Amino acid sequence: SLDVRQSIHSAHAKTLDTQGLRNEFLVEKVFVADEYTMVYSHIDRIIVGGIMPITKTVSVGGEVGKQLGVSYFLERRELGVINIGGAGTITVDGQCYEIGHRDALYVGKGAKEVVFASIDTGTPAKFYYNCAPAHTTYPTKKVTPDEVSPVTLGDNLTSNRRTINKYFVPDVLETCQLSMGLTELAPGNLWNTRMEVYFYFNMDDDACVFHMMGQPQETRHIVMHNEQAVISPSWSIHSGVGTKAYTFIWGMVGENQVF
């Protein structure tokens, strides 16, 4: 019952049709009320998902670890979380952390149980996470917009103009592999330009994004709507164009944590 995505060869992806590409790389539902979403990708074993607690609380720990063949979720992993929704809370082995909107939390190897909760069912928290294998444990850490050093790039000419906020990177804290960030395109702009995962949100219900993938010469696109994610394999490109402005979270692992 664990959504597993195998890694596919470029020659194999080349032949995939629309639905085929979607089944392999698209993560249709990231946020499901009072539950947790979880997609396991054999590409560097990154797992992706969302957690949106409303009338209940949501926990991940021992029972999840069973599915991965370990005592508990983070027995041999690090978790990267960014809250996209309303003010909420994340309790790591009893220690409670208040993570507001656009606030983040990194839970290192060792944490036995993580509990997600919203502090108001009216506008619930939308916890988006990326989880990667971890060989050493680093301290659990909360990262807020404040400590992030936003960088503004691109130009209205090329329709880039976006602010990149790096939450989890060497200069903010230490992690084994995981590197994650939040990039927001300045209204009027629609273009956003080693394996990566891209999560698209904060975009009107009618708007969408044409996510570019495939080898530089055999490119395909995956139409993406608000709050969905795509696995971008090592051999693929990852550009995207939107119908309207949008913002997205990126996460990656690979050879050197250098963004």
Structure tokens at 85: 């929704």
| Cα dihedral 79, 84, 88, 91 in deg (nearest 10) | 0
Q: Which amino acid is at 232?
A: S
Q: How far, in Å, CA of 252 to CA of 259, rounded? A: 9
Q: How far, in Å, CA of 163 to CA of 153, rounded? A: 6
Annotated binding site for Zn(2+): 196, 238
Q: Does domain 9-30+145-259 have CATH number 3.30.70.250?
A: no
Q: How far, in Å, CA of 242 to CA of 107, rounded? A: 32
Paired strand residues for 142: 105
What are the extents of the domains in the chain?
1-8+31-144, 9-30+145-259
| Cα dihedral 227, 40, 251, 43 in deg (nearest 10) | -130
Q: Do domains 1-8+31-144 and 9-30+145-259 have the same CATH topology?
A: yes
Three-state DSSP class for residue 22: helix
Q: Does domain 1-8+31-144 have CATH number 2.60.120.520?
A: yes
Method underlying the structure: X-ray
Q: How far, in Å, CA of 63 to CA of 196, rounded? A: 27
Taking only Cα atoms into account, the Rg of the chain, rounded to an integer number of angstroms, comes to: 17
Structure tokens at 119: 């502090």
CA nearest to 104, candidates 90, 93, 123: 90
Annotated binding site: 196, 238
CA nearest to 57, candidates 132, 131, 130, 127: 127
Residues with Cβ within 8 Å of 105's Cβ and at least 6 positions away in sequence, in order, are 79, 81, 90, 92, 97, 99, 140, 141, 142, 143
Paired strand residues for 228: 200
Paired strand residues for 231: 197
The helix (H) or strand (E) run that includes residue 241 is strand 240-242
Asked whether the beta carbons of 128 and 100 are under 8 A apart, the reply is no
Q: How far, in Å, CA of 88 to CA of 6, rounded? A: 33
Taking the alpha carbons of 154, 160, 161, 165 in that order, is the dihedral positive or negative? negative
Asked whether the beta carbons of 147 and 223 are under 8 A apart, the reply is no
Q: Which resolution, in Å, applies to this structure? A: 2.6
Q: How many CA atoms lie within 13 A of 137 on its CB side?
A: 11
| Cα dihedral 62, 126, 169, 162 in deg (nearest 10) | 160
